Amino acid sequence: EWLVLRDGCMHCDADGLHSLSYHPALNAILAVTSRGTIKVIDGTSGATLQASALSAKPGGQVKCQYISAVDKVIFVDDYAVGCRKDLNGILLLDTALQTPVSKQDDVVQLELPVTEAQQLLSACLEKVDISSTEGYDLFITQLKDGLKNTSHETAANHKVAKWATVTFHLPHHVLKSIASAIVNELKKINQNVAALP
Amino acid sequence: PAQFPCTDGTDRISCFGSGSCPHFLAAATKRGKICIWDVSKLMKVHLKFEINAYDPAIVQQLILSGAMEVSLDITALSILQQPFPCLLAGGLLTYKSPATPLVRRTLPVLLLYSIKESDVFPKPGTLVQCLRLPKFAEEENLCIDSITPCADGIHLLVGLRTCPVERNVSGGYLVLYKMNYATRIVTLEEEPIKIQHIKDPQDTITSLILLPPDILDNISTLGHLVITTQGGYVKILDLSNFEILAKVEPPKKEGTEEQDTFVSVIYCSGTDRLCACTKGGELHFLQIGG
Amino acid sequence: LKNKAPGLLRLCPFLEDHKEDILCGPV
């Protein structure tokens, strides 16, 4: 007879859990709720990292699996399959199962981390002047509200701050024109800032 | 982005998974179309084909089992490699047969398909081996729930379950097969190297995981297998004989006496514990060793 | 420092919070 020790339990969600997946590089448990959301929990202190919806269709049966041989996470719904990996110590799970659009005017979800968003805002407010471009006011307001919502959680937990991403719901051509204008404006001034990459 | 298995984007995916060669990710639809992506490299189209249920090997296997109507549905996906990799699909064939009115009989089989393209070797999208499951899978109308290669790389495990229909109820079967590397193509053996029965319907296997033997280092043994049942009883068994070595009862729900049944289990290396999800969404860590 | 397992001249205060479970240094 083998001995198994029990040293407590933790509460993740009241909606139930169906499937489990563990990422060994970040020590993160990717719990799959019964409502389709993926709850990312840290495995070092019991404090939950993030929550995600994968930008998939509502009511879909999300199934998440991990592979350590290739270090890749697979999300399978009733429609499509998405593959994700680590990026700067966090998993970009907001647009993991995003359906590829067919037109330039379709609204696309744009997930960004905190330091990148801060560098973008600093460049747009100090070094980059793109007020003449389409959708500039909407992008500035979205960046401002995302950063002012993130900064409250920034001073509490560093890992939860890093895992927290700002999701912009904007058209594809507007975002492409804005990013091209940022690239051109930073290239014509010969300034090497972190917002350019 | 998340690419659809087909260009139409309307078929629903029945099953998925990975095996001994997880560099390629397979996705099979309910209509019989399989798309394999090279997720190890940049996201692209690597293979795309459609399974025909009227293959000559499938036809002769169904003839040896007993117009002609056959409907094939894939329930598990795996890729086996030691020697180009091959795709192993756990299919279920439903066919009308005379009673000895027509009765729709179901039979679970394993299909092997070529993956690597040509640079008389078989072409991709064609059948390599049509393994026929033993008699108890056809008698109980079981379906292939899970396919998992073992940690040794020489053995394979197949966990079955009772297929629902659109007596003694069984919780499924554990079939351990031996890999065959006699030829240049990865194949399987007709004789199963181990057959384990689940006589308890309450012990239907829902999820499984494999524990590396080096954690215990803190006939050769093939590691340990942790399985979750329908009722939440976590069972840790030796892979050599499938004997119940460790039993973990499901916890009780808060505020009541209802069974907070475990549904899935994983292994957390940072906590060095079996992390299992409950019916109520709780997480329980089980420690091994003392 | 030994990373703590999750629950199922003076040193800096962060090291003072985990002074008992220390395993190297201060250097």
Side-chain angles (χ1 to χ4, degrees):
Chain A
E1 166 189 17
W2 199 264
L3 280 78
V4 182
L5 285 174
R6 264 197 178 172
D7 194 0
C9 78
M10 81 86 78
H11 180 56
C12 179
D13 210 359
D15 272 330
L17 286 182
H18 170 52
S19 63
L20 277 192
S21 291
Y22 174 68
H23 179 49
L26 298 177
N27 208 353
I29 306 155
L30 295 172
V32 191
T33 56
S34 307
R35 60 167 273 198
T37 44
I38 292 189
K39 197 73 190 94
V40 185
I41 314 153
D42 195 23
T44 312
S45 62
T48 312
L49 289 165
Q50 185 179 7
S52 187
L54 312 178
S55 298
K57 310 304 150 288
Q61 206 176 16
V62 162
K63 182 147 301 295
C64 167
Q65 206 185 8
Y66 77 102
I67 314 154
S68 199
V70 303
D71 205 7
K72 284 152 196 66
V73 179
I74 298 304
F75 315 104
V76 173
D77 204 84
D78 287 338
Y79 312 95
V81 178
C83 176
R84 279 288 172 261
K85 281 78 62 177
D86 193 20
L87 176 63
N88 309 327
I90 66 156
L91 290 160
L92 290 191
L93 298 199
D94 278 311
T95 70
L97 268 158
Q98 172 156 326
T99 286
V101 300
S102 304
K103 301 140 208 157
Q104 272 197 12
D105 306 337
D106 199 285
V107 171
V108 291
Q109 324 278 321
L110 194 147
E111 59 177 354
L112 270 184
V114 187
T115 312
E116 307 195 4
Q118 283 152 340
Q119 287 289 337
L120 283 192
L121 186 82
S122 171
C124 286
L125 278 181
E126 289 179 321
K127 296 159 192 157
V128 184
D129 283 327
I130 59 171
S131 56
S132 67
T133 43
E134 62 176 33
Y136 164 79
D137 199 6
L138 188 39
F139 202 70
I140 298 300
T141 318
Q142 277 181 359
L143 192 45
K144 285 167 155 27
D145 61 58
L147 277 195
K148 70 182 176 64
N149 294 355
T150 292
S151 79
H152 285 296
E153 298 188 338
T154 302
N157 208 341
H158 58 283
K159 44 178 186 175
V160 186
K162 277 316 281 163
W163 273 84
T165 59
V166 184
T167 81
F168 309 100
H169 323 264
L170 282 186
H172 176 272
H173 66 290
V174 167
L175 286 160
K176 273 294 297 288
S177 186
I178 286 166
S180 174
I182 292 166
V183 162
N184 213 357
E185 273 291 321
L186 284 170
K187 205 168 197 174
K188 60 168 68 80
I189 60 191
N190 208 9
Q191 288 179 35
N192 281 339
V193 304
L196 191 55
Chain B
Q3 193 190 355
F4 287 92
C6 293
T7 64
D8 204 67
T10 54
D11 273 318
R12 286 137 81 208
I13 301 165
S14 48
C15 64
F16 78 105
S18 70
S20 82
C21 182
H23 295 285
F24 299 128
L25 161 73
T29 65
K30 297 171 173 224
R31 300 293 303 157
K33 322 182 180 168
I34 301 195
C35 170
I36 309 175
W37 296 304
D38 189 13
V39 291
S40 53
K41 279 200 173 201
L42 178 74
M43 186 66 204
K44 275 174 184 184
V45 168
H46 185 260
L47 275 78
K48 269 184 184 199
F49 73 102
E50 188 152 5
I51 293 172
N52 199 16
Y54 300 106
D55 293 1
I58 292 168
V59 159
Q60 67 100 20
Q61 285 295 331
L62 288 174
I63 282 165
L64 287 167
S65 299
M68 161 86 191
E69 207 184 11
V70 178
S71 65
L72 172 57
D73 296 315
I74 317 293
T75 43
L77 279 172
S78 196
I79 291 159
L80 312 180
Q81 205 198 1
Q82 195 199 39
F84 65 98
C86 65
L87 161 71
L88 174 77
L92 192 74
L93 301 153
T94 306
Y95 68 103
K96 278 165 181 162
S97 170
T100 51
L102 300 162
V103 58
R104 278 266 188 172
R105 298 192 201 166
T106 62
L107 167 69
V109 288
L110 293 178
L111 307 172
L112 274 188
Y113 281 81
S114 174
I115 291 190
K116 191 197 169 188
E117 289 165 333
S118 291
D119 288 291
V120 179
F121 304 100
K123 282 185 177 178
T126 62
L127 197 53
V128 172
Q129 186 211 4
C130 186
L131 189 147
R132 164 184 183 149
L133 278 185
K135 307 186 178 185
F136 51 82
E138 192 185 16
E139 275 183 13
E140 276 197 351
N141 297 308
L142 301 174
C143 70
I144 299 144
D145 183 70
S146 64
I147 309 174
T148 311
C150 306
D152 46 7
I154 202 55
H155 281 187
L156 172 73
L157 183 59
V158 169
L160 309 173
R161 73 178 162 197
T162 45
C163 186
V165 178
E166 290 189 336
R167 270 187 174 201
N168 281 336
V169 181
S170 70
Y173 273 79
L174 288 158
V175 192
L176 204 80
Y177 274 117
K178 167 147 176 62
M179 284 330 282
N180 208 2
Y181 303 121
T183 181
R184 298 312 298 273
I185 321 173
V186 180
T187 42
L188 306 159
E189 292 184 0
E190 301 174 348
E191 284 317 288
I193 212 64
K194 177 61 194 298
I195 293 173
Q196 173 61 40
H197 65 280
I198 306 179
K199 219 49 172 174
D200 211 340
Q202 191 273 336
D203 301 346
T204 309
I205 171 173
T206 77
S207 63
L208 60 89
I209 196 71
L210 292 167
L211 300 186
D214 203 275
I215 306 169
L216 311 182
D217 300 350
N218 265 291
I219 311 173
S220 46
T221 43
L222 304 187
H224 283 286
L225 188 83
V226 182
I227 54 165
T228 58
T229 57
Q230 269 297 117
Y233 286 87
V234 159
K235 284 160 93 189
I236 318 178
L237 307 97
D238 189 18
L239 211 73
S240 67
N241 43 17
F242 296 124
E243 279 189 354
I244 306 168
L245 302 191
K247 192 77 167 286
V248 172
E249 305 216 304
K252 301 286 97 174
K253 262 195 181 168
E254 93 273 17
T256 185
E257 297 208 314
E258 266 170 1
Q259 261 185 337
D260 191 356
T261 77
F262 285 134
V263 180
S264 189
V265 62
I266 46 175
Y267 177 73
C268 280
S269 58
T271 79
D272 203 359
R273 279 147 196 165
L274 294 169
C275 181
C277 64
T278 74
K279 191 183 175 182
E282 313 179 351
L283 270 189
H284 286 58
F285 285 82
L286 298 165
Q287 187 163 343
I288 279 179
Chain C
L1 180 69
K2 180 260 294 187
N3 193 8
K4 263 159 188 194
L8 320 172
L9 301 169
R10 198 216 163 197
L11 320 173
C12 45
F14 201 84
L15 191 62
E16 290 280 343
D17 272 333
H18 329 303
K19 188 178 160 197
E20 287 169 323
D21 280 318
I22 203 175
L23 274 185
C24 293
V27 54

